[PDB]
């Protein structure tokens, strides 16, 4: 089996800068018809992969200018002239000369953008969920960068631990920002015991930790 | 009853390159490119002369480092880096040409 | 003007016959190479096999013992059957097409090009029965919004297997919708939050409903979100 | 009217480089053999990927096109350059020649490696017409022809019938040895009826 | 219990030879090498070595100087020539190893078919090709008969008729000879052509 | 295919009667010897291969 090896495997670039991706094949990729069948594929957040380069150099129709493929017979390179916020995603190389079709490991390209402080919002658990005995308090950090944030739950100034699960969106395709959803899950009995449910967010774009809380019941 | 024809085989052979294939496994192979070095000047059977402090051209003029080799006779002449052709500052004109001559001079 | 649409069961039991089918829109199946590419959860793409009309199910050796591909020229659907399924076969299953030049004699002996792709089908291979989700509204607290912007969302909790789809107001609401990745709870069930940011003046005047579809359980939910009434 | 490779190559064959062209009750069929054609294509490719390999030695200028060098050193450069030109030009013409012979003889090898396979399949149920075909001495429907291609033909299933249609006089067909049970036998309707059954009747 | 040959696998147990016979009869199964065909291959590989290992008797001297560099213009020419020389020797080197390995492999696979076509014409009409590199013998071949195939003494006429009968065979019984063309009608009994006159000379009861 | 005579003509860079300079000559010598080594190998391997 032809072995497709890509490098680097995580390629964080700066919004508007160029970068390259090297793909080395374990075998030569020439074929009887005189064409070497290496292709480059871009799979962006939550999508089918699309083909950028076919036959080492030919770019597919409907693809930005900055994508230019190059390579020889063992060593190939995808060159991006100017990585914008819309080029985030994973990039694969595939040989297409030898059975079976094989793909590279993939290179994760993440845009390095300007710092953006997160908007913070907190959600009390719905009264409908409290009928099932479980209480889910949701904290949201929306449209921010870098994707490094601290989310501490404070139930009555008591720092929570263990019951916190957080999910993170993919880097955006236009402003290159993330979004996070920390969920504090606990029982109906424990929810009804305390009053103040706070969410302390610490981030680079914040000159001091921002907190959004909510007192139990209320309005 | 039946009788069968077959060839032998082993568990892990070695891989070699061919015209139509790269890295095909044969039973046994051997290396063709030499890589092993003897870290000495194997000089058995030869009259060797290690000039050392003497430079090869110094055997003609005769600076003090080359006193032992003014009429030397050798089959193998070994120049060393520390060799000096000279004693009073100066060079030789067309020096490699003459070096190359004395190398195969036998002394 | 061509499109490929995968279809099939969302979960198949261990050792069953995982079946899928790529339905072709706006093209004749006779004129393409047809590949199945599966992608396990966060791993390299794996190329299963390729077929063309007049038959030749050339497949990858890792799965050839178990793979079975055929394609119907009247219904326009590439199909696939993976026998005796394992947890390793849990993956996204994109189908793909490639140009087919009849006269290129040497093209049937080269891996097919990957010109067009489908959206990909998730087939999670396990034994746990299908559970529809529960949808709980994530509403603002008494319009303590206090900003120029306000936030509201849904909580699609306790469902299996993946995935669920969340559209806000039947697709009319798209600007500012963040539908988070699912997270697997300690119960063996998935759960995700879908949120959307709206102007603060929109509360009360605008209707906000998230639409959840859990096709594994044929479940469809339309949950309205609104600030609490004390 | 059908022929094989001992004569000419078929132009209708386009799914591959080798195939089976059969003929029976249902008519002609031309279908390529996939395993054999890939084994030829994958070895020609092995040549390309060995000769297309690049050289990574970089040479710089020693000549000077704008400003000529000493006549001696230049003449010696020219002498070396033209001598190297001669070696590569020789090594090149030869490599193409050898690899073109090895290529041509490579494909002939894989045609026979397939012909001599189908031969052992049919065992004692077909004969070599001599032109790359097999006269099959038993009725072979379109399903049976495909059994030869995908290596499932079972000589046993058709052997007894095929050998009898092969070892003939006039129509004819060899006959089995009558049972060795001690009773004399006579031939009647393709079976050894017993002689005692023809000697217990009555006279007229 | 099965057994198969070279159009398939190589045998890892055959260690006193490169090619060999693996039989299976009443007494059991054995594996013994064929020494001739193995030496025929081992000798051709040896012949390649003693044509390639041969030394070049040409001696070269230093044109350069390591401790004390030569003129820059001439050095860039010596370098240019040396690098051009090393290029040709590197090309001829990898091409030789490749061409001789393609020949060494096709050489050995050739000596295997030579042994196969030998045993084939040996057994003449007394066996058939099963396709895996084996011969289904159609008559009992004991260990002494098996060795008669290895040392090429197998008399095919001795076991022919028996095997030719066991190959035609419609039922458990094979083809019949011709009854003598002497003018008598013959009936068939016990594998023999007994006359019909002997069956019409009795007594009505 | 083997009898095909080369057309590359070479003039004379050495001088048999009156020796050229030593350094340049030793290189000319060094190259010609290294060239002869290549044709000598190419010749013998070609005969051996064509005869085979
Ligand atoms: C060692 O080898 C080199 C290369 O072979 C050799 O130098 C070459 O000499 C020839 C002359 O025999 C040059 O060829 C042309 O000669 C004609 C004479 O009519 C000129 O007009 C040419 O110059 C014009 O034409 C060019 C082509 O249109 C233009 O591009 C150019 O700008 C001029 O307008 C040209 O001189 C040849 O150019 C050189 N090659 C070089 C210098 O690289 C050299 O003589 C050999 N040494 C010995 C001792 O034999
Ligand atoms: C023509 O080609 C030759 C060889 O291909 C080339 O001469 C080589 O040059 C390199 C680089 O200058 C030499 O390699 C080493 O370079 C490093 C500098 O990076 C030095 O430090 C080395 O010093 C040696 O000597 C020391 C004692 O004084 C030792 O302590 C040390 O360990 C080293 O051994 C050394 O110079 C290389 O040695 C030479 N080769 C020869 C044969 O001299 C030359 O430059 C080329 N000509 C042109 C015009 O390009
Ligand atoms: C580079 O290589 C050159 C040859 O490859 C070297 O040139 C050769 O140098 C040798 C000496 O080392 C010469 O040999 C001498 O030749 C003279 C004259 O020969 C003629 O007369 C004799 C006697 O009647 C006769 O037998 C010959 O056939 C000639 O007719 C002799 O008298 C000497 O005894 C001695 O043999 C070669 O002649 C010479 N070759 C050529 C072609 O000139 C050259 O020295 C090398 N360069 C370096 C730097 O080493
Ligand atoms: C010998 O092989 C060559 C290729 O190595 C064959 O020529 C090629 O045939 C294909 C036919 O499908 C041509 O493809 C077409 O190319 C154009 C670009 O020019 C492309 O846009 C089309 O969509 C189509 O794919 C290809 O151009 C052509 N190459 C040439 C003419 O240089 C040739 O037919 C083979 N000959 C035999 C006798 O088998
Ligand atoms: C061989 O072909 C026949 C139809 O001609 C089919 O029924 C059978 O399954 C095939 N066998 C294999 C192993 O593909
Ligand atoms: C050949 O083998 C047979 C059977 O083993 C044996 O009787 C005979 O002596 C052998 N002859 C030779 C010449 O090897």
Residue E152 Cα: closest atom of ligand 6: 1
- Can you tell me which atom of ligand 4 is nearest the CA of A32? 5
CB A114 within 8 A of CB A164: no
Torsion on CA atoms C10, C14, C15, C17, rounded to nearest 10: 0
- To the nearest 10 degrees (0 to 180), the angle between helices B95-103 and F22-51 is 50
Ligand 4 atom at minimal distance to the Cα of residue A35: 5
CA–CA distance, C215 with C159 (Å, rounded to integer): 11
**Tokens 């087919």, located at residue:** C100
F34 closest CA partner among E83, D106, D127: E83
Question: Helix D71-122 crosses helix F22-51 at what angle (to 10 degrees)?
Answer: 20
Could you please report the per-residue DSSP string of D123-171? Answer: TTSEEE-SSS-EEESS---HHHHHHHHTT---HHHHHHHHHHTTS-SSS
**Residue in D11, D35, D24, D41 with CA at minimum distance from that of residue D149:** D35
Peptide bond into A100 cis (omega under 30): yes
Residue reference for tokens 């004109």 = B93
Q: Give the integer Cα–Cα distance in Å for B55 and B103.
A: 11
- Compute CA distances F24 → E63, E74, E94, F36, whole Å: 10, 9, 32, 18
- Do residues A178 and A167 lie in contact, with contact meaning Cβ atoms separated by under 8 Å? no
Closest Cα in chain F to D76: F13
**Length of chain D as a residue count:** 204
In Å, how far are D6, D136, D137, D145 from D129, measured between CA atoms? 11, 10, 12, 17
Q: Helices D71-122 & D142-149, crossing angle to 10 degrees?
A: 140
Instruction: Please give the number of the atom of ligand 5 that sits closest to the Cα of D150.
Output: 1
In sequence order, the 6+-apart residues with CB closer than 8 A to the CB of B99 are B56, B57, E65
B97 chain-F contacts, CB cut-off 8 A: 21-23, 26
| Omega prior to D164 cis, within 30 of 0 | no
Q: Which of residues 32-91 of B touch E (CB under 8 A)?
A: 32-33, 79-81, 83
Closest Cα to atom 50, ligand 1: which residue? Answer: D75
Lining residues, ligand 5, CB within 6 Å? D 143, 146-147, 150, 152
Q: For tokens 């075909």, what's the residue?
A: D133
D176 pairs with which residues across the strands? E175
D120 interfaces chain B, CB cutoff of 8 Å: no
**Tokens 């899950």 map to which residue?**
A185
- Whether the Cβ atoms of residue C118 and residue C95 lie closer than 8 Å to each other: yes
Give the separation between CA B74 and CA B56, rounded to whole angstroms. 12
Tell me if chain F has a CB within 8 Å of the CB of D92: no
User: Nearest 5°: phi and psi at B16?
Assistant: -135, 160
Spatial neighbors of F52 by CB under 8 A, at least 6 apart, are: none
Backbone CA torsion sign across C224, C228, C229, C230? positive
Rounded CA separation B58/B82 (Å): 13
CA-nearest of A118, A111, A117, A102 to A45 is: A111
Collapsed DSSP state (helix, strand, coil) of residue E77: helix
Backbone torsion region of residue B87, taken as left when φ is above 0, otherwise alpha when ψ lies between -120 and 50, otherwise beta? alpha
Residue C135's SS3 state is strand
What resolution in angstroms does the PDB record give?
Answer: 3.5
Q: How far apart are CA A24 and CA A29, in angstroms?
A: 11
Considering only CB atoms, E88 lies closest to which of F26, F31, F38, namely F38
DSSP 3-state of B19: coil
Contact between D72 and F23 under an 8 Å Cβ cutoff? The reply is: no
Chains that touch F (3 or more CB pairs under 8 A): B, D, E
CB-based contact C81:C69 (threshold 8 Å): yes
Contacts of E53 in chain F (CB under 8 A): none
Instruction: Check if D109 contacts B (Cβ < 8 Å).
Output: no
Is cis: bond before D8, omega within 30 of 0?
Answer: no
Contact between D76 and F1 using a beta-carbon 8 Å cutoff: no
Cis bond before residue C161 (omega within 30° of 0): yes
With beta carbons less than 8 A apart as the criterion, state whether E154 and E148 touch: yes
User: Residue C52 contacts by C-beta under 8 Å, 6 or more apart in sequence?
Assistant: C32, C33, C34, C100, C108, C112
Which residues pair with residue D136 across a beta bridge?
D126
Q: How far apart are CA E63 and CA D193, in angstroms?
A: 103
Tokens 């000369």 belong to A97
User: Which residues in E144-159 are b (16+ Cβ under 10 Å) and which e?
Assistant: ebbbbbbeeebeeeeb
Structure tokens at C82: 């993976």
Beta-strand relationship, A119-123 and A134-144: antiparallel
Query: CA-CA distance, C68 to B23, in Å (whole number)?
Result: 32
State the Cα–Cα distance between residues B17 and A139, nearest whole angstrom: 62
> Is there a contact between D178 and E188 if contact means CB atoms under 8 Å apart?
yes
E32 C-beta closer than 6 A to ligand 6: no
Distant-in-sequence, close-in-space partners of C226: CB < 8 Å, separation ≥ 6? C137, C139, C152, C203, C204, C208
- Phi (first) and psi of residue E134, to 5 degrees: -120, 165
Q: Give the count of alpha carbons within 13 A of D68, CB side only.
A: 6
Look at residue C110 and give its three-state secondary structure.
Answer: coil
Give the C-alpha separation, F29 to F14, whole Å. 9
Residue F13: nearest ligand to its CA?
1
Contact present, C141 and A122 (Cβ < 8 Å) = yes
Query: Which helix (H) or strand (E) element contains residue D194?
Result: strand D191-194
Q: Are B99 and B57 in contact (CB under 8 A)?
A: yes
Q: What is the 3-state secondary structure (H, E, C) of B31-76?
A: CCCCCCCCCCCCCCCCCEEECCCECCCHHHHCCHHHHHHCCCCCCE
Please give the structure tokens belonging to residue A34: 């005189």
Q: Where are the alpha helices (DSSP H) in C13-156?
A: 61-64
For residue A84, give every residue at least 6 positions away whose Cβ sits within 8 Å of its Cβ, in sequence order, or none.
Answer: A15, A16, A111
A46 lines ligand 4 (CB under 6 A): no
Is any Cβ of chain B less than 8 angstroms from the Cβ of F19?
A: no
Atom 40 (ligand 3) nearest CA = F16
- Which pairing describes strands B76-78 and B48-50: parallel, antiparallel, or unpaired? parallel
Please choose, from the candidates A96, A98, A67, A71, the residue with its C-alpha nearest in 3D space to the C-alpha of residue A84: A67
Check if the beta carbon of residue A38 is closer than 8 Å to that of residue A94.
yes
- Judged by DSSP in three states, C56 sits in coil
Pairing of strands C77-83, C17-25: antiparallel
Q: Could you tell me if D52 lies within 8 Å of chain A, comparing CB atoms?
A: yes
* Distance from C-alpha of A52 to C-alpha of E68, rounded to nearest angstrom: 55
Biggest CA pair distance of chain F = 46
C222: helix, strand or coil: strand
Question: CA nearest B19 in D: which residue?
Answer: D47
Tokens 């319009």 correspond to C143
* Distance (Å, whole) CA C93 – CA C20: 8
Q: Which two tokens stand for residue D79?
A: 């002498």
In contact, A17 and A82? CB cutoff 8 Å:
yes
Contact of chains C and F by CB distance (3 or more pairs under 8 angstroms): no
Cα F10 → chain centroid: 11
- What is chain A written as a DSSP string? ---EEEE-SEEEEETTEEEEEEEEESS----TTS---EEEEEE-TTS--EEEEETTTEEPTT--TTEEEEE-SSEEEEEEEEE-GGG-EEEEEEE-SSSSPEE---EEEEEE---BPPEEEEEPPPHHHHTTTEEEEEEEEEEEBSS--EEEEEETTEE--SSEEEEEPPPPSSS--EEEEEEEEEEHHHHTT--EEEEEEE-TT-SS-EEEEEESS--
Query: Which tokens hold the place of F1?
Result: 């295919």
Instruction: Determine the Cα–Cα distance for residues A121 and C141; give it in Å rounded to an integer.
Output: 10
Q: Are A178 and A147 in contact (CB under 8 A)?
A: yes
* Strand A10-14 to A107-112 pairing: parallel
Residues listed for chain F: 52
| Residue C19: strand, helix, or coil | strand
Largest CA distance in chain A: 76
The rounded radius of gyration (Å) of the Cα atoms in chain F is 15
Are the beta carbons of C55 and D146 closer than 8 angstroms? no
Answer yes or no: are the C-beta atoms of E134 and E4 closer than 8 Å.
yes
The b-or-e profile of D36-59 (16+ CB within 10 A means b, else e) is: bbbbbbbbbbbbbbbeeeeeeeee
Q: Could you tell me which of C180, F16, F33 has the C-alpha nearest to residue E61? A: F33
E strands, C55-205, are 58-59, 67-72, 77-83, 91-99, 116-117, 121-125, 134-138, 149-159, 165-168, 177-179, 183-184, 190-199
> Any idea of the CA torsion for E10, E13, E14, E16, to the nearest 10 degrees?
150
Q: Which atom of ligand 5 is nearest to the CA of D144?
A: 5
Cα B33 to Cα B26: distance, rounded to the nearest angstrom: 19
Does ligand 1 have an atom closer than 6 angstroms to the CB of D131? no
Chain B closest CA to F26's CA: distance in Å? Answer: 8
Residue among C31, C104, C107, C115 whose CB has most ligand 4 atoms within 8 A, to mutate: C104
Contact call for residues D195 and D182 (beta carbons, < 8 A): no
Residues D15 and D38: their CA atoms lie apart, in Å, by 11
Would you report the helix, strand and coil content of chain E in percent, each value rounded to 5? 45, 15, 40
Ligand 4 contacts CB of residue C146 (under 6 A): no
The verdict on the CB of residue A34 being under 6 Å from ligand 4 is: yes
CB D63 within 8 A of CB D79: no
Sheet strands side by side (includes A210-215) = A158-159, A150-155, A196-202, A210-215
Count of residues for chain C? 230
Q: Which of A97, A106, A142 sits opposite C197 (nearest CB)?
A: A142
Angstrom distance (rounded) from CA C139 to CA C148? 17
How many CB atoms are located within 10 Å of the residue E20 CB?
A: 27
């Amino acid at each position: 089996d032809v072995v497709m090896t890509q490098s680097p495997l995580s390629l964080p670039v700066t919004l508007g800068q160029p970068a390259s991706i090297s793909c080395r094949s374990s075998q030569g990729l020439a074929f009887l018809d005189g064409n070497t069948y290496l292709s480059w594929f871009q799979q962006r957040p939550g999508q089918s992969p699309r083909r950028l380069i076919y036959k080492v150099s030919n770019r597919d129709s409907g693809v930005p200018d900055r994508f230019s493929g190059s390579g020889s017979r063992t060593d190939f390179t995808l060159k991006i002239s100017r990585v914008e916020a819309e080029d985030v995603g994973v990039y694969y190389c595939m040989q297409g000369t030898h059975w079976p079709l094989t793909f590279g490991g993939g290179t994760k390209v993440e845009i390095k953008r300007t710092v953006a402080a997160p908007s913070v919002f907190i959600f009390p658990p719905s009264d409908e969920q409290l009928k099932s005995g479980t209480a889910s308090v949701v904290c949201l950090l929306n449209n921010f960068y870098p994707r490094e944030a601290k989310v501490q739950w404070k139930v009555d100034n008591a720092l929570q631990s263990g019951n916190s699960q957080e999910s993170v969106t993919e880097q955006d395709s236009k402003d290159s920002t993330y979004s996070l959803s920390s969920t504090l899950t606990l029982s109906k009995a424990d929810y009804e015991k305390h009053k103040v449910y706070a969410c302390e967010v610490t981030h680079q774009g914040l000159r001091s930790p921002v907190t959004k809380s909510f007192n139990r019941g209320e309005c | 009853d039946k009788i069968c024809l077959g060839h032998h085989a082993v568990s892990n052979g070695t891989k070699v390159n061919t015209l139509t294939e790269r890295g095909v496994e044969v039973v046994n192979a051997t290396e063709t490119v030499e890589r092993t070095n003897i870290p000495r000047i194997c000089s058995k059977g030869k009259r060797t002369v290690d000039l050392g402090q003497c430079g090869l051209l110094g055997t003609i003029t005769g600076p003090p480092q080359c006193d032992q080799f003014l009429e030397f006779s050798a089959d193998l002449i070994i120049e060393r880096r520390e060799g000096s052709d000279v004693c009073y500052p100066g060079k030789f004109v067309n020096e490699e040409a003459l070096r190359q001559i004395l190398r195969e001079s036998g002394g | 003007q061509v499109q490929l649409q995968e279809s099939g069961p969302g979960l198949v039991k261990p050792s069953e016959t995982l079946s899928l089918t790529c339905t072709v829109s706006g093209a004749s199946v006779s004129s393409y190479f047809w590949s199945w590419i599966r992608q396990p959860a966060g791993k390299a793409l794996e190329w299963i096999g390729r077929i063309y009309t007049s038959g030749n199910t050339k497949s990858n050796p890792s799965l050839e013992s178990r793979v079975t591909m055929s394609l119907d020229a009247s219904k326009d659907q590439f199909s696939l059957k993976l026998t005796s399924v394992t947890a390793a076969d849990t993956a996204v299953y994109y189908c793909a097409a490639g140009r087919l030049d009849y006269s290129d004699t040497t093209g049937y002996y080269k891996p097919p090009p990957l010109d067009y792709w489908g959206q990909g089908a998730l087939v999670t291979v396990s034994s746990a029965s299908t559970k529809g989700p529960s949808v709980f509204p994530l509403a603002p607290s008494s319009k303590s919004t206090s900003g120029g912007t306000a936030a509201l969302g849904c909580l699609v909790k306790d469902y299996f297997p993946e995935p669920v789809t969340v559209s806000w107001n039947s697709g009319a609401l798209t600007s500012g919708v963040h539908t988070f990745p699912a997270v697997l709870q300690s119960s063996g069930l998935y759960s995700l939050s879908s949120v959307v940011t709206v102007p603060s003046s929109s509360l009360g005047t605008q209707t906000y409903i998230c639409n959840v579809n859990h096709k594994p359980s044929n479940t469809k939910v339309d949950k309205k979100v609104e600030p609490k009434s004390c | 009217a059908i022929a094989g490779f001992i004569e000419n190559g078929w132009e209708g064959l386009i799914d591959g480089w080798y195939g089976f062209r059969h003929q029976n009750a249902q008519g002609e069929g031309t279908a390529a053999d996939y395993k054999s054609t890939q084994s030829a294509i994958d070895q020609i490719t092995g040549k390309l990927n060995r000769l297309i390999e690049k050289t990574n030695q970089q040479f710089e200028l020693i000549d000077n096109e704008f400003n000529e060098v000493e006549k001696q050193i230049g003449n010696v450069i020219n002498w070396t350059r033209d001598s190297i030109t001669e070696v590569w030009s020789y090594n090149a013409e030869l490599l193409v020649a050898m690899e073109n012979q090895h290529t041509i003889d490579l494909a002939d090898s894989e045609m026979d490696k397939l012909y001599e396979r189908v031969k052992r399949q049919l065992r004692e149920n077909a004969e070599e017409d001599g032109t790359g075909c097999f006269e099959i001495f038993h009725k072979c429907d379109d399903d049976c022809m495909a059994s030869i291609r995908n290596n499932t033909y079972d000589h046993s299933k058709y052997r007894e019938e095929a050998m009898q249609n092969r070892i003939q006089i006039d129509g004819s067909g060899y006959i089995p040895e009558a049972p060795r049970d001690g009773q004399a036998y006579v031939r009647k309707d393709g079976e050894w009826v017993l002689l005692s059954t023809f000697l217990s009747g009555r006279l007229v």
